[PDB]
From a paper:
A pH-sensitive mutant of the polymer-forming sterile alpha motif (SAM) domain of human translocation ETS leukaemia (TEL) protein (TELSAM) was previously engineered. It was then shown that genetic fusion of a panel of target proteins of interest to this TELSAM protein polymer could consistently achieve their crystallization. (i) The long TELSAM polymers are expected to confer increased avidity to any weak crystal contacts made by fused target proteins, allowing crystallization of a greater fraction of proteins. (ii) The regular spacing of target proteins along the sixfold helical TELSAM polymer is expected to pre-programme much of the symmetry and spacing of the resulting crystal lattice.
We chose a DARPin orientation that would allow it to non-covalently bind a second target protein using the DARPin's canonical binding surface while minimizing clashes between that second target protein and the TELSAM polymer. Thin plate crystals appeared in 3 days under various conditions, diffracting to around 3.2 Å resolution. All inter-layer contacts occur solely between DARPins from adjacent polymer layers. Inter-DARPin contacts bury only 147 Å2 of solvent-accessible surface area and involve a single salt bridge between Lys 368 on the canonical binding surface of one DARPin and Glu 275 on the back side of a second DARPin. Tyr 369 appears to stabilize the position of Lys 368. Since this is a DARPin–DARPin contact, each DARPin makes two such contacts to other DARPins from the adjacent polymer layer. The weak inter-DARPin crystal contacts and vertical displacement of polymer layers may also explain the observed diffraction limits, growth defect and scale factor of the thin/short axis of the crystal. Taken together, these observations suggest that the avidity of the inter-layer, inter-DARPin contacts was sufficient to stabilize these otherwise weak interactions.
Numbering used by the authors: 1 to 79, 84 to 162, 172 to 415
Amino acid sequence: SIRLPAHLRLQPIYWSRDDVAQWLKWAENEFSLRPIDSNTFEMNGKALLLLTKEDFRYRSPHSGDELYELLQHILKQRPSTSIRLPAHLRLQPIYWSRDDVAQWLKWAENEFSLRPIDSNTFEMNGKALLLLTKEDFRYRSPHSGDVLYELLQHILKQIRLPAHLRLQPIYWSRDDVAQWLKWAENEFSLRPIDSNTFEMNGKALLLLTKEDFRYRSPHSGDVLYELLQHILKQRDLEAEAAAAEDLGKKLLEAARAGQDDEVRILMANGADVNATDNDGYTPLHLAASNGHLEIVEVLLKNGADVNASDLTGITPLHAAAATGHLEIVEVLLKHGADVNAYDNDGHTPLHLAAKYGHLEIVEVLLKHGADVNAQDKFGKTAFDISIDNGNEDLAEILQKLN
């Protein structure tokens, strides 16, 4: 089994800083581990539980693997988690001022016994603190950085762009780069940085690694790199949608001309499946109106709206029924096209089929439940439309159904 001393018998969360030091000394003796400095883990039991095995490994390369697994054994035996926040820190870390971040450091040292960290170690506001990675926390404070990061993640669980800098960072000029440093300085309450430190253009700036940012500006470097990466994620998402709306317009014309191969190519690259023109037409509208049966089926597979209405109120079923494309009607009906859809003038698909004398479509519409008694704004049923046209064949089938 596992045997523990009396002074360490208590649960690890309640351990004092001295208890944690005695645990390392006891661990080294019991397991013949390489001698460990008492200062390697200057924290209480509550802070120790926050550490991941990675942090244990980094603090002690030789015995960090064993110490973590040994601590995990103790934790299993007993059957950090609850943190009390002061009023000034009850605000969400996003809204924290730079003074709030300094107070958070002071409270963390009191709550978890930690080596004193200067307020200038994290000279930034709450927004910048969230950007920093765990490695940045360790670099700024080796003794307490990892604990602070894990503490911040627990609190969390429990980008405005200036117009002149709206453009992509690749095209940033030398003057634009300096303004980005200034705007970031006031936005994140960073320490002011000289323009000479980053004497380069936007395309030159992108080459730099994260270490280059920390070398040129120790105080604000890591924030600036993480900020630049967030912009690129924003721009990539921004430009990806602007390219999709332009490919959607190409899909509208490609679905109008019957370009089967080009439609699949545009769809594969992210063209909008439900793109709309000025008249309100979608790629499914135009393909159905012009009888491109093959294109209609691929659009349905990619998620095009079968019952979408344009500005006039005409659904794809209306266009397919009016132009006499019987095959497309059956496919649309299968994908749950509305048989009784009304356009602005009150014409159901049955009305349009009767208006242009497509007898085969009329039978299919009546079979799928199209309303015979439905009336348009002129108070005319589909049967009435056929009488004026003179289509005796269509009229006879309608006349039978009262």
